[PDB]
Amino acid sequence: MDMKRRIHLELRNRTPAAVRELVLDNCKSNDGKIEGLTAEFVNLEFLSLINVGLISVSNLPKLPKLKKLELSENRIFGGLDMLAEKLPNLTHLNLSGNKLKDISTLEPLKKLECLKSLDLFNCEVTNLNDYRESVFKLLPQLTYLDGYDREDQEAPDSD
Amino acid sequence: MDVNPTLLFLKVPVQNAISTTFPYTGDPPYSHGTGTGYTMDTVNRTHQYSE
Amino acid sequence: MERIKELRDLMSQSRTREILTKTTVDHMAIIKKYTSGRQEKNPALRMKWMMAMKYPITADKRIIEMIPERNEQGQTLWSKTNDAGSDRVMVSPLAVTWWNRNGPTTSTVHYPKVYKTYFEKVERLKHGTFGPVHFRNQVKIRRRVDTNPGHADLSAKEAQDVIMEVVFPNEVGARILTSESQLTITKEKKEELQDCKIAPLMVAYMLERELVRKTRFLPVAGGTSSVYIEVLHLTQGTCWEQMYTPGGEVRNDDVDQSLIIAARNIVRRATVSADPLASLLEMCHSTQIGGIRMVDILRQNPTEEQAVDICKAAMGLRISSSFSFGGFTFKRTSGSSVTKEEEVLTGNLQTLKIRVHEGYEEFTMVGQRATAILRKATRRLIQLIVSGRNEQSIAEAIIVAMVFSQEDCMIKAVRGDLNFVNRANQRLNPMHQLLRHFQKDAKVLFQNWGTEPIDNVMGMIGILPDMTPSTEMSLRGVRVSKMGVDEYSSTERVVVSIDRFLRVRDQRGNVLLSPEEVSETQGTEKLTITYSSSMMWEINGPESVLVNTYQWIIRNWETVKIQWSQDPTMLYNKMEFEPFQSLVPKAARGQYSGFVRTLFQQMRDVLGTFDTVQIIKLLPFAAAPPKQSRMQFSSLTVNVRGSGMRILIRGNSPVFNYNKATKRLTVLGKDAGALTELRGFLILGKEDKRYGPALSINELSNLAKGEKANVLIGQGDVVLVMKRKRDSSILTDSQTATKRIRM
Amino acid sequence: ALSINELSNLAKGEKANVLIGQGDVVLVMKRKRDSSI
Amino acid sequence: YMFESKSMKLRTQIPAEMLANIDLKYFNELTKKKIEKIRPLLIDGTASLS
């Protein structure tokens, strides 16, 4: 079941304007891009693209209200500049298990105003020295990187 | 960053930070050269240089 | 179309019509054995004769259209002779090689999985490790060991039900359709063998070869595993041992120990009850070890442990005549005995009552790390021969025999007070009290036993009281044996009467397994044990209580949901949640409950918030006299073994996590079950034309919850069938009708 | 008792016991009002 | 020297005193050359080192 199918399977005869949390993981990508979602999704605030073979997020929809996006287990190697404009209100991003290999790749996220968490587990960029410090200086608004704030104090629950 | 301690020599002369290049302060836990092979080789070398 | 013509012409002659009409489908296998011919004596000679002539091997009349009569050199591959009487044309073995060379290719992806029981051997040897050959004089005991690794611990009868459901779905019988035991293997194999064209009969044979266990009573000299016995020819020899290690995978024998633990708990809580038999039977038919009903496990496994033995005996199952004492099972070979409880005085002049076993008898004392043969008369240790590995095992066997020697020397040699209690603080058997009293030290008892000379007959090292070798001086009647002592090849299964106090006597009157010699340990089972009685949940500790509560809520999800959405007050005060409320802190049962109750109300008010997982997680906290407080809890505490665990309202936690991408819920690591965020039919009568022509067992998939259709059940007869309403099981409901009359 | 690392999960107004020191346990109540310089 | 047979799982030792007669097939090429070159100097198990 590719995205276009499961989306409708998850649409559940409920109009796109009335979805607030959509879960689409392990499904597929057309070739390496999200296909099936459309801008009519306006009430969505939790999209989970986990394990969907995804080579980029170029053709992502426009979700004003998105706040909890997660692209873990995919193979994004850049092109995150789109997420800034297309998800102005995103405040919880989960890029774990992807193919990011440089701090430069995370430069585009600097212009997201309301960012609160960035999970970056199992990514080749996490093997660097002064990794967390460099990330926290490139993304000053961040207050939880990988789960801990600044002194390795776990992020409080109920987020 | 990828830490490269040798790059420290770009700022401090080598003789100032020469201690950096000495790996061990103590007898290592391994035997470097010994046994019948390294003795026969020494005998052969000594005779070769005077053949 | 041709087969029906064959049947018609068979019935035309009025001599086979008798056989074809009067022989019920039951009496077909006994007709199938009226073969003709004389088979063949000396088949090797016949083969050497056949291969000399041409056209030895018969083949069906299809080669003609797919194998040329002559290869590219003019050699007749096949002939036209119709061996004996049949359509099979004779063929020369050149045809086999012609097929293997210029033949129709194919894709073989179903072979490495249909023949798993051989490729497993291949991949297990391919990764084996070899060690140096040691030429020590090998001692080879004669153990009975498993010779089928990965047998999937099925019997020889339920394997047939698996085969009939994987390879012959349209010939399944009534005993399967009108059931609720689907098994897991039958859903994996059905998926794997979905398009196999191999050989339905061969697929069945391979499946029953893979899904059965066998034993051989082989001369083993180490290892004893299920995988070390296939390579016995490679590992051990008459004078050599080639150290070796199969490199495949092993079986986890955890179901057996879980069964042992469940049997122990059930027997305790049934004997501490008013009517032990009813409790035992109801628990067996209701309790489940890792999902499977305990009755199926008891009728499936061969495990031989005391508690399981009593559980089987109370269920009218044959139990081994051998009795287990001190970890060694004692198979009687000869003699008779009588318990004859008599009185004695211990070393400290303490009165004691012990069953003086009166009568001369010989036992084989087989054990895990030692073996022995012990023949004794009343208070007379006539002879004890021991063997095993190291002197520790030899000493263990010797002391076990000495304790069960009926000699008063051990009784009078006691040092201390023989007042021993178990984990349950109960009065153990005085002989058993002696057993544990002496299990640690017996030096003074060895000195009392003394030492006598030995004549060095055939080579038999004697054992000194210091547990050391001696070629001349050895303990009394104790003769450590070299060249090993062989075990037995039979168990002599018998039915034994059970008294009302969990003492398994027999028709002869000798106790085999007293209930007091069962509390060896009370560790934690690896699987999950589920009980159908709210009282039982508070037996194995907080972990079991939580797991059973959540599994019960899952079991009855539809009823819980309807009652929660319609009559919440009744649901919030059921009995099943009283054990759970024992864990919750006393000073917070109310404040918690209200918070849940109010929150639950929020789900009934606004639609779209009906979260199954949240409701199941938070429901057990509702049962309480709820209070009111503005506090908005984030996590609710629970007391487990004195530690405060926490259950998260919104999210997952160790006490409760429902894994997404799957329907499985886990509580404290222990598996709870499946939560949803063919079979089950009932026969009604013979053919009824009002419902139209008969169906096949496949088409029955297209029926409603109560629609009636007539199907061709099994091999032959057609029976009207209908889907079932209500679970309709054999749980306590059947017991109630039977136990109520037993008043 | 709750380890001092776990009491951070208590909600406002909750009360529980914590191992606050050497073999010592005390009852602690979370303040609804949060004060800070 | 120490000879190891990995097909028989054997670990034997050859004392230096036997280097004057042992067949020169077990050793590798470099050790074989060393032994061959030093053999003329072997007296009573030692090796002259003037």
DSSP codes of every residue in C48-70: HHHTTSS--EEE-TTHHHHS-SB
Reading phi first (left if > 0) and then psi (alpha if -120 to 50, else beta), residue C500 is in: alpha
d(CA C243, CA A7): 59
Instruction: Give the CA count within 13 Å in the CB-facing half-sphere of C456.
Output: 4
Instruction: Please enumerate residues of D whose Cβ is less than 8 A from a Cβ of A.
Output: 8-9
User: Most B CBs within 10 Å: which of A125, A127, A129, as the mutation test of the B interface?
Assistant: A129
User: Most E CBs within 10 Å: which of B39, B43, B45, B46, as the mutation test of the E interface?
Assistant: B43
d(CA C538, CA C547): 11
Q: Which has the closest alpha carbon to A46: A12, A19, A83, A18?
A: A19
Cα distances from C677 to residues A46, C47, C334, in angstroms, run 19, 65, 63
Reading phi first (left if > 0) and then psi (alpha if -120 to 50, else beta), residue A50 is in: beta
Could you tell me which chains touch chain C, where touching means 3 or more CB pairs under 8 A? A, D, E
Is E33 exposed, middle or buried (CB count within 10 Å of its CB: 0-12, 13-18, 19+)?
middle
d(CA C16, CA E38): 98
Count of other CB atoms within 10 angstroms of residue C241: 17
Cross-strand bridge partners of residue C361: C335, C376
Check residue C643 and report its DSSP letter: E
Q: Do chains B and A touch (3 or more CB pairs under 8 A)?
A: yes
Q: What is the largest CA-CA distance in chain C?
A: 103
Contacts 24+ apart (CB under 8 A), C649-656: C649/C614, C649/C617, C649/C618, C650/A158, C650/C614, C651/A157, C655/C546, C656/C550, C656/C617
Check residue C91 and report its DSSP letter: E
Q: What is the CA radius of gyration of chain B?
A: 19
CA C557-C562-C564 angle, to 5 degrees, is 90
For tokens 């009903």, the residue is C293
Check residue C189 and report its DSSP letter: H
d(CA A110, CA C344): 90
Count of other CB atoms within 10 angstroms of residue C100: 8
Handedness of CA A136, A142, A143, A145 (dihedral sign): negative
Q: Which amino acid is at D7?
A: L
Contact A65, A44 (CB under 8 A): yes
Do B36 and E49 count as a contact with CB atoms less than 8 A apart?
no
Spell out the residues 6+ positions from residue C197 whose beta carbon is closer than 8 angstroms to its own.
Answer: C110
Cross-strand bridge partners of residue A145: A118, A148
Supply C711's token pair: 């199907």
A134 at interface of B, judged by CB pairs closer than 8 A? yes
Contact A34, A40 (CB under 8 A): no
E32 at interface of B, judged by CB pairs closer than 8 A? no
d(CA C349, CA C355): 18
Supply C567's token pair: 């009559």
User: How far does CA C332 lie from the centroid of its chain?
Assistant: 26
Check residue C372 and report its DSSP letter: E
Q: How are beta strands A93-94 and A68-70 bridged, if at all?
A: parallel
The number of residues in chain B equals 51
Cα distances from C598 to residues C193, C264, C622, D10, in angstroms, run 52, 42, 10, 20
Handedness of CA A105, A108, A113, A114 (dihedral sign): negative
Check residue A59 and report its DSSP letter: T
Supply C78's token pair: 């096949």
d(CA C161, CA C179): 12
d(CA C645, CA C653): 9
User: How far does CA C535 lie from the centroid of its chain?
Assistant: 27
Supply A26's token pair: 């392990």
- Residues of C within 8 A of D5 (CB-CB) are none
- 3-class secondary-structure state, position D7: helix
Query: Resolution in A for the shown PDB structure?
Result: 3.2
Contact C464, C398 (CB under 8 A): no
Do E47 and B46 count as a contact with CB atoms less than 8 A apart?
no
- Outline where DSSP puts E strands in B1-51: none
Cα distances from C361 to residues A23, B38, C24, C395, C436, in angstroms, run 73, 73, 52, 22, 24
Handedness of CA C588, C592, C595, C597 (dihedral sign): negative
d(CA C439, CA C224): 27
d(CA B27, CA E14): 29
How is chain B split among helix, strand and coil, in percent rounded to 5? 45, 0, 55
Contact C134, C214 (CB under 8 A): no
d(CA C141, CA C371): 9
Cross-strand bridge partners of residue A48: A23, A70
Reading phi first (left if > 0) and then psi (alpha if -120 to 50, else beta), residue C47 is in: alpha
* Terminal CA-CA length for chain B: 57
Check residue A127 and report its DSSP letter: G
Do C634 and A158 count as a contact with CB atoms less than 8 A apart?
yes
D25 at interface of C, judged by CB pairs closer than 8 A? no
Q: Which has the closest alpha carbon to C588: C626, C535, C544?
A: C626
